[model samples]
Target: GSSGSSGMDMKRRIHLELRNRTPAAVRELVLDNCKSNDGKIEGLTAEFVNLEFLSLINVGLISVSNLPKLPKLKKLELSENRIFGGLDMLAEKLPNLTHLNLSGNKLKDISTLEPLKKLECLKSLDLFNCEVTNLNDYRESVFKLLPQLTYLDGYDREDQEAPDSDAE
Candidate 1:
């Protein structure tokens, strides 16, 4: 009988590919288009605690909660993840985030975005193509509620810029 080939599953292949480049001091990581529903990153350990940027775009994740604490993380992009809602846990996990992108997700209604009010440092947020974007007066409601946010869907907010002291 002929011996069959060893099947190296998809998960093992991904792990092997990451092992060569994964390092303790890595600051920015983008695992976009990896075809993963649950990108559990607990194995990154405390060594990667200094991460400042992370993106999981189109990774098939339905929800991202209980993520590893990355205190230095300022920008997070989870665009097109099919995520319905989970901002509550996200707010608690990342308090100092300055930018967030959730465009093209399944988010609906403005009330669900209330949890983001807790992100004190949040300056930018994107919700383009999301179901929530269809709500009436969405921009007004978002800006009124989240005063700290300066940018929405990649555009700067009116009056968000400092007034010109040299104006004639």
Candidate 2:
């Protein structure tokens, strides 16, 4: 049957899309210029199964209150947004996230990410252009708190015995 074969083909396409669904641009952002909240995040319940990339650049998404507990969200880019809070909620929700980028936001304190020690799969964390001023000041206790971090925004100058990972 021609119709039966067509239906099977549609199913195969849907499966592949789900395995590689990366939200690059939204329906209303229209080239990443979200001047109003009308194009902001309104969906609270979307299925995220092995989604690779999620980029929310220069949007008005001020608060990421709930991330829906994505199991396979690998790369998340939330740059130049208005996110004032809800940094720790990410750690509680996404367990398998490996790379996270959070630059150019209104977040002040970063002690909430201390609980993010639970995220074993996280390798790279980007804080290049955040609003944090005093977080990297407490450099003494940061290494002890996050013992698994291979790199940080701040350097540990107190540890003389620490092996030098930097070389010219």
Candidate 3:
């Protein structure tokens, strides 16, 4: 009964998973490959105040507007989704975010990313395989645009590779 469920079942499964834990006690959440047809995440709440890491890779998310305030969140992985823009809410909702990955999405313009400047603590940003990456001088412009970033697309100012494993 549990082997062939489709991705659409994620919302209910996630709720079932969280039902057994205290919201404030949750620190990290990974919902990779979930199909969020409504572009909204389920079961996340401001009550999960201690949450530090979140990953929603390939989840079909198109917007971050529904995210609840997660003040302690430091690392966020949102790669392989349908997100185009509207990142301004993140700086306010995840004030302490330090690492953000937006690779393999629909982002196509630098102007679409300008809102990220408000994230003062952001240090690492990955935009690989995005349309915006094809723009001329993309790397240089992104670096200049987000001066606080210490690593862009897994490389630092000196082109040194950043330690890659984010899984724990």
Candidate 4:
């Protein structure tokens, strides 16, 4: 009974953490630095069903394996999570995604991005500071795989850029 009560509490806390939104009303959720472990994401997954955008920056995630289905999700920001695995699950889950940011993570090996090839709506990808950035023809390879992409690493083919979200 204690565990049941605690789980309910966790769900409640997660729900309240989203600023008192109902599970259906949540379109965007930013859980940046919300916890020291990504396991808390499980709790969030149970509650965030209609979210269109999600950000999980600097949440101590070392890997990503268990994200709940977000059918409406269009953008995901995972900067600085140190994630080392599970792109397969990510690409499978967020089919509607248009923008994805993986900057400052531990991703290497360009092939790891293959799973994202099917994301036809993906227009932007950010891999700044990732080890893959040092590889030869990295941008070319990514562009080859995702020709639909209009933005990469904060720049477009025209050299346009997003305002630094981290800049104070």
Write model 2 residue lDDT over 1-168, tens digit each, in one string: 122222233223223333434433222112132342342454333454545666556655676664566665666777777776566677767776666666677756656457657777765555556666356564444445566654444322343332368310
Candidate 1 vs candidate 2, lDDT winner: 1
Measured with C-alpha atoms, the lDDT of residue 32 in candidate 4 is: 68
TM-score of each: 0.78, 0.60, 0.90, 0.80
lDDT of 1: 0.71
Q: Any idea what lDDT model 3 has? A: 0.82
Cα lDDT for residue 84, candidate 2? 61
Q: Please give the distance, in angstroms, between residue 151's alpha carbon in candidate 2 and its true position after superposition.
A: 3.6
Worst 10 residues of 1 by lDDT: 1-10
Q: What is the per-residue lDDT of model 4 for residues 67-166, given as tens digits with 9 covering 90 to 100?
A: 7878788889989877765677777788778888899888897787888888888888889899988999888878887778888987775667756773
Candidate with top lDDT is 3
Instruction: Please state the error at residue 159 of candidate 1 in Å.
Output: 8.6
| Worst window of 10 by summed lDDT in candidate 3 | 1-10
Error of 4 at 64 (Å): 2.2
Q: Kindly report the root-mean-square deviation of model 1 from the true structure over all alpha carbons.
A: 7.3
Candidate 1 lDDT over residue span 6-105, tens digit each: 2332244335435656645667776666554253432334445767887767665676663766788899998977788768777877779988899988
Report the Cα lDDT for residue 123, model 4: 82
**lDDT tens digits, residues 110-149, model 3?**
8777988999899888899999999999888888888888
Query: Evaluated with TM-score, which candidate comes out highest?
Result: 3
